Amino acid sequence: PDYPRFVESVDEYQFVERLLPATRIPDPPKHEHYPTPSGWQPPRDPPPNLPYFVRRSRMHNIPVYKDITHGNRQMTVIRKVEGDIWALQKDVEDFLSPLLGKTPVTQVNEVTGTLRIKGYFDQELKAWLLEKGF
Amino acid sequence: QGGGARALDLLRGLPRVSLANLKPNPGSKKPERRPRRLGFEGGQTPFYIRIPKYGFNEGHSFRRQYKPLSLNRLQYLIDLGRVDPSQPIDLTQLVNGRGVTIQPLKRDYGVQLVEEGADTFTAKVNIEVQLASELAIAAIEKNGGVVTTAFYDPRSLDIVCKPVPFFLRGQPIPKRMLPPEELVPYYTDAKNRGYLADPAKFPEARLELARKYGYILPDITKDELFKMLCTRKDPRQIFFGLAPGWVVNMADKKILKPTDENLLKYYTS
Amino acid sequence: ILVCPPLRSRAYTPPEDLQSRLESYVKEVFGSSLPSNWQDISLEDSRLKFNLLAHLADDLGHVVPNSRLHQMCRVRDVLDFYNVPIQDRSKFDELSASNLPPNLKITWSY
Amino acid sequence: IGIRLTLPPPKVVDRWNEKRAMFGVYDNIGILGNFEKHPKELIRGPIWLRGWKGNELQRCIRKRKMVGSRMFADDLHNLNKRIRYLYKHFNRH
Amino acid sequence: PEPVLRKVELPVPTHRRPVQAWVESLRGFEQERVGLADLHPDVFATAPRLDILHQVAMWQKNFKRISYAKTKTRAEVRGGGRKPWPQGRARHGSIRSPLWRGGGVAHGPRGPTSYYYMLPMKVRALGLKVALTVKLAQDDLHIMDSLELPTGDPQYLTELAHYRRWGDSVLLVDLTHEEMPQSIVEATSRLKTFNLIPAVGLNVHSMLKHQTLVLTLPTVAFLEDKLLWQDSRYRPLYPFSLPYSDFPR
Amino acid sequence: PLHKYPVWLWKRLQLREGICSRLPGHYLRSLEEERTPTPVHYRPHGAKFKINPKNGQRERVEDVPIPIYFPPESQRGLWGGEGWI
Amino acid sequence: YRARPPPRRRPGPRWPDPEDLLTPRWQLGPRYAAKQFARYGAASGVVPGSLWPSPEQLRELEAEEREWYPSLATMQESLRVKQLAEE
Ligand SMILES: [Mg+2]
Ligand SMILES: [Mg+2]
Ligand SMILES: [Mg+2]
């Protein structure tokens, strides 16, 4: 029956709104000097004119990922490739062949737009793709 | 140049895609094969039995765990706009920006700030964590930021990390408990920037870090963001601007505060 | 009541005066401002693209399908599309139309 | 012997009956409906098998847990026996 | 009177351009080319992933399947408790052994058996994009300003589809169930192969079942908004049914 | 098939039908009440929580009464809650 | 054909019949009422004053707090005693 008395305060609700998360990934803020302290750089504008295009991830990172299977098969994967993937395969082969001293073994997945490379070249490929403007 | 547009161009010639011409990707299906106690060695003492018992995992479920947040990760989150340095950074903002994942049911007690990436850390932030290393604190202070270590209990940590699920329960905001006796020394020590530590000692501790690591302690009082930098929550406050005992009504966008004397005394105690 | 018009034949043969007929239509939609390099006029403007393609479909009776609309970037692209003949004959008619040797007999049971 | 000497009545399936014509509709109720409802809520069937899958042992354990108290005596006895039988079978006893 | 010109409301990647479709009308037989609409390339010009279509089609087929087939084991068949006497008694343990006529089934169906599983949310969303892209690429997608009809007679809609060479089966998608025009509702309710669904009901199975897909302009904006949201969203903290700062809208 | 109600609830359903339903409301409540008898043959835990000696952690503790058998003879007399164990 | 209306979550608070024996008990108590108010607010019909603890519940809350949650001064004093003994 008897219940504690209370007051309805709308003014303080603004603090509650601070606590609500966003579903949408925010767009990176504009910086005066690139790259940022963490090393991030936005994609070039306008897009580089090439036969292929490498889209950024939803987090605005370059989609180059290390992959391993069987505990020993180190591989590098380039995802979100659009356009002529075969043109990217030749460009990657010319770029990596000096470092290895041989033509790199690769697999082109035209359906998924994925280039798979044997060995770890994620760091080198990320910088290489950043220069192109992707 | 055309790879996506070429595939769609080929589609125009081919027959209409339908339920009659679909197939799984080659390699996604292994063909089924049709025919058409463990740890027992057969009599001897098993290997896993003949090894002596040792307390490797004794009390594992009661050990405290802290998710590591590095300065590299923190700087990366700030660079991409997922954590805003212009406001106090706490567990809620870190979780909301997907910077860290906290599992209270797995004995997580918060985030521990780690020194990895201190050399390149440039952001000026006001950040509340549960544990911080000496080097991590120095990196934040050297940039004019403020770092404080605060304790959240399992119930409080669950609420702070996921506020909206709590508000939907319909319970009044509880007051977070004090740290256990063992932790009390850590959180009452200025060297750790403890939230329960004496504010007067802080200047001395802050200067000692500047001397040891060879940087000039900046004067945040002169900073434009000083008011935000010194913003801190009461030891009993889970959320900024929200007191214990308040009930959040998200449907009507209202907050209900109790006026009963006994209730007010309990929540403020 | 509404009477459905008879089914239209899909056969298409490019008119010999197509380039002249297009040049006129382009001058109407886009004006006479840029006669030089009329075939290079871009169709990025949706309103201009609609008027040109709509006029050609009404007159010629052959319309760019949805799949090819994005490919009509320039006026030259529109000219190339209308230079492609379309045939509406059935496969039986196609086989019979092609000269068959005296010893080949094709019967259609449909 | 063993094979029918006449053809069975021809099978006539109505591919465009209402059930087939509308199959799959609302399977994206969540993705396209602000996630107010989950697709598994569409599933009709036993109360203990809605939006859940498992092997026979797991199904029997789940059925007894959810509706065991409402089962008929003989059915419940068979279910209890089955679980015990399956428990030994699936655990390689 | 005036060409209906629809532009892509959401941002398009700078390296791509929107694809286009003709805007038509059902108010008259020859009311084609009433407008020109722009379609987001990431929804209507995605890579044609036939394998993903198979993934989503099979998921729709089986995820809600419940098999009610069940047999009786030797422990459930009536009787059979005793060891048959005929000359020891053990030679046969029970008359309901699977080897015996009328015995239990050794390895029969033990239902009800569920086939429930869920594809990742992003995969199911991608399937819808592929289906929409496949329809447009094969000239099976027609965009309407509205589904309003001159009359409710089904023979009109049938003749209209025939005149425009749509195909034997047409899927009609309107924005909302409540605001569906009565004229199209009456016509499609008497037609077996002309099916009318709301936008929320769009699914890969129905799209493949029907040769032709008809979407209204509002439905296009609705589809692009829902499907593109998956591309840029965060990982979920909790179910999207619960409140978020920016969701819904 | 399944029953509409759990078999353990059939008893309570009987009180909603026929002569049992017409019984006084105050009397019916006495039947519905399930008060816990005073501990006689076991020693109850003092508090809801206790500190586990083995691991030094606060853990919830519950009182589990011992089943007591009351022979028909006890109904004639007054045993003060005691019974056969 | 025309598809049947899309399945929609039933609107508003659901108050299960308390008398019905098939009504789950978890839907009866106060923990369920509090969730109906948080989700639907005023439209729930729950009296907001019930959300907070009552004098009886509050007394038990404070009793539990003092028993297992000592004050800061008590913990600091206890630590000093242990530090002296160990030293
Ligand atoms: Mg891997
Ligand atoms: Mg038997
Ligand atoms: Mg049988």
From Swiss-Prot, chain C:
Localization per Swiss-Prot or TrEMBL: Mitochondrion
Primary subcellular site in the record, as a coarse category: mitochondrion
GO cellular component labels: cytosol; mitochondrial inner membrane; mitochondrial large ribosomal subunit; mitochondrion
Keyword Ribosomal protein included in the entry's annotation: yes
Biological processes annotated in GO: mitochondrial translation
Family membership noted in the UniProt record: Belongs to the mitochondrion-specific ribosomal protein mL50 family.
Quaternary structure (record): Component of the mitochondrial large ribosomal subunit (mt-LSU). Mature mammalian 55S mitochondrial ribosomes consist of a small (28S) and a large (39S) subunit. The 28S small subunit contains a 12S ribosomal RNA (12S mt-rRNA) and 30 different proteins. The 39S large subunit contains a 16S rRNA (16S mt-rRNA), a copy of mitochondrial valine transfer RNA (mt-tRNA(Val)), which plays an integral structural role, and 52 different proteins.
Protein name per Swiss-Prot or TrEMBL: Large ribosomal subunit protein mL50
Native organism: Homo sapiens (Human)
Organism lineage string: Eukaryota, Metazoa, Chordata, Craniata, Vertebrata
Parent-record interval covered: 49 to 158 of 158
Curated annotation (Swiss-Prot), chain D:
UniProt key word tRNA processing: no
Annotated compartments: Mitochondrion
Chief localisation class: mitochondrion
GO CC annotations, alphabetized: mitochondrial inner membrane; mitochondrial large ribosomal subunit; mitochondrial ribosome; mitochondrion
Listed GO biological process terms: mitochondrial translation; translation
Domain of life assignment: Eukaryota
UniProt keyword list: Mitochondrion, Ribonucleoprotein, Ribosomal protein, Transit peptide
Molecular functions (GO terms): structural constituent of ribosome
Assembly information from the UniProt record: Component of the mitochondrial large ribosomal subunit (mt-LSU). Mature mammalian 55S mitochondrial ribosomes consist of a small (28S) and a large (39S) subunit. The 28S small subunit contains a 12S ribosomal RNA (12S mt-rRNA) and 30 different proteins. The 39S large subunit contains a 16S rRNA (16S mt-rRNA), a copy of mitochondrial valine transfer RNA (mt-tRNA(Val)), which plays an integral structural role, and 52 different proteins. Interacts with OXA1L.
Similarity comment: family membership: Belongs to the mitochondrion-specific ribosomal protein mL51 family.
Protein name, per record: Large ribosomal subunit protein mL51
Span within the parent record: 32 to 124 of 128
From Swiss-Prot, chain E:
GO terms of biological process kind: mitochondrial translation
Subcellular location: Mitochondrion
Cellular component, GO annotation: mitochondrial inner membrane; mitochondrial large ribosomal subunit; mitochondrion
Positions of post-translational Omega-N-methylarginine modification: 101
Domain of life: Eukaryota
Sequence similarity: Belongs to the universal ribosomal protein uL4 family.
Protein name stated in the entry: Large ribosomal subunit protein uL4m
Swiss-Prot record, chain F:
Subcellular localization, as worded in the UniProt entry: Mitochondrion
Expression tissues: Found in a variety of normal tissues including spleen, testes, thymus, liver, kidney, brain, adrenal, lung and retinal tissue.
One GO cellular component term: mitochondrion
GO molecular-function terms, A-Z: RNA binding; structural constituent of ribosome
Keywords: Mitochondrion, Ribonucleoprotein, Ribosomal protein, Transit peptide
Top-level taxon in the UniProt lineage: Eukaryota
GO BP annotations listed: mitochondrial translation; translation
Subunit structure: Component of the mitochondrial large ribosomal subunit (mt-LSU). Mature mammalian 55S mitochondrial ribosomes consist of a small (28S) and a large (39S) subunit. The 28S small subunit contains a 12S ribosomal RNA (12S mt-rRNA) and 30 different proteins. The 39S large subunit contains a 16S rRNA (16S mt-rRNA), a copy of mitochondrial valine transfer RNA (mt-tRNA(Val)), which plays an integral structural role, and 52 different proteins. Interacts with OXA1L.
Stated family: Belongs to the bacterial ribosomal protein bL28 family.
Other observations noted: Potentially represents an important therapeutic reagent for HLA-A24 patients. This antigen is recognized by tumor-infiltrating lymphocyte (TIL) 1290 in the context of HLA-A24.
Protein name: Large ribosomal subunit protein bL28m
Full-protein positions shown: 2 to 86 of 256
